[PDB]
Amino acid sequence: TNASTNSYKRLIPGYEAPSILTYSANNRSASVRIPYGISKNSARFEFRFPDSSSNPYLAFAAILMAGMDGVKNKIDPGEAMDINLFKLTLDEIREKGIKQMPHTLRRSLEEMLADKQYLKESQVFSEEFIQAYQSLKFNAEVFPWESKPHPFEFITTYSC
Amino acid sequence: SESKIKEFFEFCKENEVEFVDFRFSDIKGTWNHIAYSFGALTHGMLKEGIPFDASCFKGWQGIEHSDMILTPDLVRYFIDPFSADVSVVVFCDVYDVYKNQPYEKCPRSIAKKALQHLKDSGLGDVAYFGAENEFFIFDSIKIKDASNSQYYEVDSEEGEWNRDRSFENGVNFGHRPGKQGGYMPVPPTDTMMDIRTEIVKVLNQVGLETFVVHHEVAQAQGEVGVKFGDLVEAADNVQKLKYVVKMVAHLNGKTATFMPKPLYGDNGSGMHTHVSVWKNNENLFSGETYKGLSEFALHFLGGVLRHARGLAAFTNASTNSYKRLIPGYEAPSILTYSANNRSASVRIPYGISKNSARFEFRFPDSSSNPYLAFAAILMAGMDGVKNKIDPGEAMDINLFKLTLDEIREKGIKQMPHTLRRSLEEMLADKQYLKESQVFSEEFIQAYQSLKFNAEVFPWESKPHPFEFITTYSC
Amino acid sequence: NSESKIKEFFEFCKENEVEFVDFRFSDIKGTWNHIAYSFGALTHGMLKEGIPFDASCFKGWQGIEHSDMILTPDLVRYFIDPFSADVSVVVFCDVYDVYKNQPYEKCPRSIAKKALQHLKDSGLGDVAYFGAENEFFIFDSIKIKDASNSQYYEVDSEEGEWNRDRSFENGVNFGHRPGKQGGYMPVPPTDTMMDIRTEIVKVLNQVGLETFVVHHEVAQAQGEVGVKFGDLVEAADNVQKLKYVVKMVAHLNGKTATFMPKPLYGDNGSGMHTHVSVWKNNENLFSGETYKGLSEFALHFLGGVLRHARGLAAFTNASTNSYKRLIPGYEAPSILTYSANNRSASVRIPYGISKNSARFEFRFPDSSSNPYLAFAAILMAGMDGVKNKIDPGEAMDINLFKLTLDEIREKGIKQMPHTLRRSLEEMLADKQYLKESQVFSEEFIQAYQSLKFNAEVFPWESKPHPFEFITTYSC
Amino acid sequence: SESKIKEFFEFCKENEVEFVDFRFSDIKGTWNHIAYSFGALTHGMLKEGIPFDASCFKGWQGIEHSDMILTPDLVRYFIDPFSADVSVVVFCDVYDVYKNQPYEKCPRSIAKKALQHLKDSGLGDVAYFGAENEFFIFDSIKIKDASNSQYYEVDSEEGEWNRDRSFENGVNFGHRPGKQGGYMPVPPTDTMMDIRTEIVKVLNQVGLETFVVHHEVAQAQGEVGVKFGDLVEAADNVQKLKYVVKMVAHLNGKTATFMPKPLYGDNGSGMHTHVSVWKNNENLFSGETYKGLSEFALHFLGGVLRHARGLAAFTNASTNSYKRLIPGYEAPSILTYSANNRSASVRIPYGISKNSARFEFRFPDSSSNPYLAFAAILMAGMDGVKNKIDPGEAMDINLFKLTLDEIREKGIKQMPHTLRRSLEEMLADKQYLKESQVFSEEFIQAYQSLKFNAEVFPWESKPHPFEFITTYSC
């Protein structure tokens, strides 16, 4: 869903972009949001963390495969947080054990590769593909961003 | 401290000194100065110290307790060669006046606490360090940090990018080292021969005995071999070395940098660090356990390699640092040792007499605080000998081989790829730093918050021009 | 001016081959003014009687019908001007009021003697020592525009973050620039002013001033020189010399200086960190053991300075530009309390605080102030404190810039005034501690009030500001 | 609300509408819109409302409770004349879904609560307001907000500053109204005759009956007389008026502004506001107590003048507002009333038939939120009649006389000189606003924090180019 390193320049607090993985009604600091209307015909979630750098097929496919694991394994989503999520400290993050979004695509691929089974159900995401997708994203996005100098390093480090 | 002070005052008198320039290093590694008109110096002013506002350095003091003291250390002082009016530079230590002890967040204070912790354990007497600081001399550097635009461009008359340019009414003199071709064509292809040579003269001018001076592999790059010194003194001369190179670049109308990786696809700058430990005039690194080295030396190495993934947070202290740790540029990404091997993290040089036995750690870069890097390495090497840490087996292959498979199937730990992972690993393994309070945990916690905000959070949050080649059309 | 001192002054001139005497005097605003006499046309009598001039040209001073006034030279701290091509000695002067046959009650330097003499007369002290740190800026360029359809300024400096991308002599940019808020204290070549700062203190000493420290400061083109403490007038005198010396040295090397409080938005302002001690019979009355090395006498002094503080801002923070600096978070005080080692506080107790050195440092004044009036008024407010045994309240050893707008009002915490208009109001509604012994005569106060409203307030309140165009243009 | 909805849906059908543009005013006064593709509109979508993210407007919602609703009010809708594809504009009300009541921080909600509070007290039935919105048409506007530079420059071919300029290869046509000379020279000195005339046509196009159109005193300035309307409807048409003038300026390649004072030394823009209160078809302002007015009307005025110093926080809501409240430009600084007097705060116009009796409050400017200004004035005028407030005596002199003395010795309150003093006074006297919860204190507290940060704190903190003329040499 966040398949470029540029995705992670967006996942920074304070721009109505989620860094904290919780749900709340009427909350644009949360990863998931319950809209106000929420009739019967309209009951739904809204996931605010995905972006258009994602392949919509893979993104939608994967979102559905992860929700279905939830129904199979009766997974509790925990407790809603009806606070301003961008106001929580780095203390309040770690101490209160609050599962935040990954900061880079590299960690996201690591997290995916270490948890790939809910996608492999019924060969929906075959393993050959996953290794291809992993190989693609490391060579297209990560290895070039990790290896091409960035102009801010020139403000920071040039004077050393 | 009043031994020195008479004499130092006498040294100022006969060098016709008008300013004493107190210099001290913040956490980041930046050299800072504050000049006192000589006539206004009393002997008592050097016991007490120099007050200053230590709230202006991130990682040090908050404004509520802003006052601090500089404690001049009257060693390696020298006349500033560049200042128009006579100035003496003196290194200084930061004294915490709220705890009435040397400042546990003073980098040079830590470096003294580490070279003492080795005295105190009995393992060694001296810890000798020897830095090769690769650097670059560009003509021009232009930067842009803004909402809609990030931008950099270094410039050098040697660069492949100028082969077609018009300089002085359209005259171009050709003769350019290629990409990675600077080692070591003669002039006029080498345009820095007199620039490097005059640097060396001024380095000697400030009390730095020099050895070798050459062009390096990358297009505008250089190096000067300076003499091994003890841990602080080694780091003291790094501060000096950089000041001279940057300032002579400046006099001749250029601009220097020791930053790790300024050019894509060309060599980065290394701080090739040479260490040996001695005791009672016997070099403890020399033995016959392995290619002229002692098992004591290999245990040291066992400790450096063991904590290296975390040690990198002090030796590779900029995000730019990791743009260099890419295979194929004589920069190590794999944590092993080998003789005469520059794909390796550590190198055993060729000479290895019982007098010159040492390691060369190739993975640090000059973006580091020299004080912290040298300090941290020694705390990692001492942990090794305490626990007689196994450094593993030598790898005498070209390490830039079988990347994906042989690394995961058989191979050993490699350097962290981003500054963030280096900090995670650092925080997850900090005891070898904390013994004898060399690295107090408040300092360690100060450095983590400072480095995430200065280095990681901006890099993770300012978009990069390559994402526009990749993703703009997404 | 005793003719023991006029004689030796004449000999100082003959053996230094002086061809012009530059009589200098300070109007109310703080501008140093001069009038040069061809030496040799100088009488012994002209140093007694004085020098005529046109005091109708100075707003707050004389009308044209009674325009003639006298300069009275004071033959102390004179100096040979290094800059003038032909040799000139500068000599200080006061205005003598010839219609009232008293030293001019609106002459700021005359006020500064009347303020220091009111102390020796009251017996509280002998000397009042002042020591100012005037932070300044050395720019490359300043461009301004005041017109019907355009307001505009631009300072420029090679060190400025705005030049990180500029093309210079042949489009070469040297890099190495301190960040916004980063000038303290990177070494060169990031520090470009090391030879300029060094050349300043060389000339400061040339003009009879002693310097201790010289460093780059926190803002991008900012600098500072520490000068020796001096008595109330002499300190204000050395401030006039210092301002001239850096302005002219910036100038000889092709630049332009300023001591104005806040030229750069988003970077540190310039302060006049003023250090006070009162001594008597060679004992330092500020040192004691009531508090961190300070006496009851000193703490009552501080309470008086703190009580009248909001009105005192009118002489120490005498431009509207002063109040762009008095914003939280740039080591500039907005909260009127004291604390040791605290740069968020209005007053600061330095760490050293020996007996000989016991002192306060007031961080709220700036160099837009007339040093005579500022020092004079600071002393008149501290003396009220000792007379009325004023308690300065309780020290606040917190980060003062961290306190909320709730924590401000609810906790009743007396903050600095936000504009010069409120500061003049606060002064005009509390003017008595200055009027003691006619030090600040009321005619002057009304002149000073009239001057500052017409020079600074009414123009700033009435000239559109470019940010209103970002805010309001789209309405 | 389903009366309208059928018909409105029928109005869209025969105007071939593809977009319905829901427009609603935040605290600042900014008009905001959100367009729905018509085909996707169900009748139910207009009962429920339009969801939106009300956390994006300072002074409204925090992100934790971001969702809100727009409640379309199906009055004064009109086809957008400018939009390429057919659009209908509809005003909207913000509904608080956490309190299930109209949003106490919705300006247009307050304006309905005030025109109801007058129904509810019995004093009056209708409150008629009539705005003259002076504005400016420039060719170009350039701004700079930065660390080292603040900068503005408007441009107009009429300005005194262009008398010597080369335009189209160096042709300059002369004929320029002087400084303050625009009232009302004929063309070609008047270059805006067709620009003003076409504005009026489009104003009629959106349901605004017009009266007069002239050049105003300042060089690029203009005005259109629009018909009195009730309190909300008056403010509704101000939103419309501004949109049209700004957009027609834009079509013809120019740029408009209703900002109070764009040019130094030239006239500012006023929102000359005309009020009368009526009941049972009898105009309550008309009487014989004073020059054709009732004592009821003078009590109203007594209340407006009494709270004016605080009322200014809503009528003069920008720091720029106070750059206009300077004597000598037909802008009031002294709070008194007078017949046929434009130095006065309030003016009794000449006509004053028992049908047209009214006041003209000259001190507001178009920088205000029209909803809040109109609302706040009525709450101040009603307090007056409750307390039968004495408005003092008329001052029929040129008020720009004897400034320093006669003001302090004999004279009455004058307008606050900065936005900050206007807010202080507002917070120190807020009851006449708070009765019947027209202005709830949370709204009043929201507006104070919003206005200090948007208007005061930037103005008090960004240096002004004139300080450089004054102080640079200090």
Q: What's the CATH code of the domain at B281?
A: 3.30.590.10
**Cβ contact D–B (≥3 pairs, < 8 Å):** no
D102 and D93 Cβ atoms separated by less than 8 Å: yes
Q: Does the annotation list C343 as a binding residue?
A: yes
For the record, the structure tokens of A157 come out as 């480090």
Residues D17 and D143 in one domain: no
Question: Which of B469, D130, B301, B250 minimizes the C-alpha distance to A140?
Answer: B469
User: In this structure, which amino acid lies at residue B58?
Assistant: K
CA gap D350, D364 in Å, rounded: 20
Query: A140 vs B247, B319, D264, CA distance in Å?
Result: 40, 20, 57
Q: Report the gap between the CA of C176 and the closest CA in chain A (Å).
A: 5
Q: Which residues of C fall within a CB distance of 8 Å from A158?
A: 175-176
> Chain A within 8 Å of C176 (Cβ-Cβ)?
yes
CA gap B417, B428 in Å, rounded: 17
Closest-CA residue of D relative to C461 is D323
Whether residue C472 lies inside any domain: the answer is no
B271 and B365 Cβ atoms separated by less than 8 Å: yes
The neighbour count for residue B472, using CB atoms within 10 Å, is: 8
Residues B302 and B237 in one domain: yes
Q: Does the annotation list A107 as a binding residue?
A: no
Residues C185 and C259 in one domain: yes
Respond yes or no: is residue B288 known to be catalytic: no
Cβ distance A159 to B257 less than 8 Å, yes or no, reads yes
> Chain C within 8 Å of A158 (Cβ-Cβ)?
yes
Closest-CA residue of A relative to D67 is A26
The full DSSP string for chain A is ---SHHHHHHSSTTSS---EEEEEET-SSEEEEE-S---TTT---EE-S--TTS-HHHHHHHHHHHHHHHHHTT--------S-GGG--HHHHHTTT--BPPSSHHHHHHHHHTS-HHHHGGGSS-HHHHHHHHHHHIIIIIHHHTTS--HHHHHHTTT-
For the record, the structure tokens of B190 come out as 């080498």
C48 and C6 Cβ atoms separated by less than 8 Å: yes
Q: Which of B80, B223, B383, B455 is catalytic?
A: B223
CA gap C448, C420 in Å, rounded: 12
**Please, which residues have CB within 8 angstroms of residue B310's CB and are 6 or more apart in sequence?**
B422, B425, B426, B427, B428, B429, B430
Question: Which of D328, D318, D341 minimizes the C-alpha distance to D422?
Answer: D318
User: In this structure, which amino acid lies at residue B237?
Assistant: N
Dihedral (CA of C273, C278, C284, C286) sign: negative
Q: Could you say which of B106, B139, B154 is where a domain stops?
A: B106
C172 vs B19, B40, B140: nearest CB:
B140
The neighbour count for residue A20, using CB atoms within 10 Å, is: 19
3-state helix, strand, coil in chain D (%, to 5): 35, 25, 40
Q: Which of D64, D66, D69, D98 to mutate to test the interface with A (most CBs of A within 10 A)?
A: D64
Residue list for the binding site of B for Mg(2+) = 132, 134, 216, 223, 272, 360
Whether residue D467 lies inside any domain: the answer is no
SS3 category, C50 = coil
Q: After which residue numbers is chain A interrupted with C–N beyond 2.5 angstroms?
A: none
Respond yes or no: is residue B132 known to be catalytic: yes
Q: Could you say which of D106, D130, D156 is where a domain stops?
A: D106
Residue list for the binding site of D for L-glutamate = 267-268, 324, 330, 342, 362
Cβ distance A158 to C179 less than 8 Å, yes or no, reads no
Question: Which of B105, B107, B22, B113 minimizes the C-alpha distance to B369?
Answer: B107
> To 10 degrees, the CA torsion angle through B385, B386, B392, B395?
-30
Residues B111 and B101 in one domain: no
Dihedral (CA of C446, C447, C448, C454) sign: positive
Print the domain residue range for B150: 107-462
For the record, the structure tokens of C385 come out as 């404190």
Q: Which of C109, C363, C421, C456 is catalytic?
A: C363
Residues C330 and C385 in one domain: yes
Give me the total of CB pairs closer than 8 Å, taking one residue from chain A and one from chain C: 10
Cβ distance C151 to D156 less than 8 Å, yes or no, reads no
Residues C65 and C155 in one domain: no
CA gap B35, B205 in Å, rounded: 20
Q: Which of A157, A159, A160 to mutate to test the interface with C (most CBs of C within 10 A)?
A: A159
Give me the total of CB pairs closer than 8 Å, taking one residue from chain A and one from chain D: 34
- Count of structural domains within chain C: 2
Residues C53 and C139 in one domain: no
Q: Does the annotation list C269 as a binding residue?
A: yes
Q: Give chain C's length.
A: 475
Residues C277 and C380 in one domain: yes
> Chain B within 8 Å of A160 (Cβ-Cβ)?
yes
Whether residue C326 lies inside any domain: the answer is yes
Respond yes or no: is residue C217 known to be catalytic: yes
Q: Which of C27, C33, C153 to mutate to test the interface with D (most CBs of D within 10 A)?
A: C153
Q: Where are the beta strands (DSSP E) in B50-148?
A: 50-53, 67-72, 78-79, 87-96, 101-102, 126-133, 135-138, 140-146
Cβ distance D53 to A24 less than 8 Å, yes or no, reads no
Residues D226 and D312 in one domain: yes
Give yes or no for a cis peptide into B184 (omega within 30° of 0): yes
DSSP state letter for C241: H
Residues B81 and B116 in one domain: no
C76 and C121 Cβ atoms separated by less than 8 Å: no
Closest-CA residue of C relative to D240 is C475
C335 and C400 Cβ atoms separated by less than 8 Å: yes
**Please, which residues have CB within 8 angstroms of residue D372's CB and are 6 or more apart in sequence?**
D27, D29, D107, D110, D111, D314, D317, D447
Using only C-alpha atoms, what is the Rg of chain C? 23
> Chain B within 8 Å of C174 (Cβ-Cβ)?
yes
Whether residue D470 lies inside any domain: the answer is no
**Please, which residues have CB within 8 angstroms of residue C458's CB and are 6 or more apart in sequence?**
none
SS3 category, C156 = strand
> Chain A within 8 Å of B366 (Cβ-Cβ)?
yes
Q: Does the annotation list C277 as a binding residue?
A: yes
For the record, the structure tokens of C260 come out as 């104005």
Question: Which of B394, B138, B340, B150 minimizes the C-alpha distance to B256?
Answer: B138
> Chain C within 8 Å of A155 (Cβ-Cβ)?
yes
Respond yes or no: is residue C133 known to be catalytic: yes
Whether residue D315 lies inside any domain: the answer is yes
Q: Which residues of D fall within a CB distance of 8 Å from C248?
A: none
Q: Could you say which of C78, C107, C136 is where a domain stops?
A: C107
Question: Which of B27, B120, B375 minimizes the C-alpha distance to B235?
Answer: B375
Check which CATH number belongs to the domain holding C21 and give it.
3.10.20.70
> Chain A within 8 Å of B326 (Cβ-Cβ)?
yes
Whether residue D474 lies inside any domain: the answer is no
Residues B132 and B49 in one domain: no
Whether residue C455 lies inside any domain: the answer is yes
Cβ distance A27 to D65 less than 8 Å, yes or no, reads yes
Dihedral (CA of C326, C328, C332, C338) sign: positive
Residue D146, φ and ψ in degrees, nearest 5: -165, 165
For the record, the structure tokens of D103 come out as 């949003």
Q: Report the gap between the CA of C47 and the closest CA in chain B (Å).
A: 35
Give me the total of CB pairs closer than 8 Å, taking one residue from chain C and one from chain D: 223
Query: B295 vs B87, B276, B306, CA distance in Å?
Result: 48, 13, 16
Residues D98-126, buried b or exposed e (16+ Cβ, 10 A)? eeeebbbbbbbbbbbbbbebbeeeebbbb
> Chain A within 8 Å of D99 (Cβ-Cβ)?
no
Question: Which of B356, B331, B371 minimizes the C-alpha distance to B227?
Answer: B356
Whether residue C272 lies inside any domain: the answer is yes
The chains in contact with chain A, meaning 3 or more Cβ pairs closer than 8 Å, are B, C, D
Cβ distance D64 to A86 less than 8 Å, yes or no, reads no
Residue list for the binding site of D for Mg(2+) = 132, 134, 216, 223, 272, 360
Q: Report the gap between the CA of A30 and the closest CA in chain D (Å).
A: 9
3-state secondary structure string across B170-200? CCCCCCCCCCCCCCCCCCCCCCCHHHHHHHH
CA gap D96, D92 in Å, rounded: 13
Using only C-alpha atoms, what is the Rg of chain B? 23
Query: A106 vs A50, A128, C272, CA distance in Å?
Result: 16, 19, 52
Q: Which residues of D fall within a CB distance of 8 Å from C150?
A: 151-154, 161
B321 and B365 Cβ atoms separated by less than 8 Å: yes
Closest-CA residue of C relative to A157 is C176
**Please, which residues have CB within 8 angstroms of residue B474's CB and are 6 or more apart in sequence?**
A4, A52, A53
> How was this structure obtained?
X-ray
Dihedral (CA of B392, B394, B399, B405) sign: negative
CA gap C276, C129 in Å, rounded: 6
Residues B132 and B59 in one domain: no
Question: Resolution reached, in Å?
Answer: 2.8
Q: Does the annotation list A16 as a binding residue?
A: yes
Q: Does the annotation list C276 as a binding residue?
A: yes
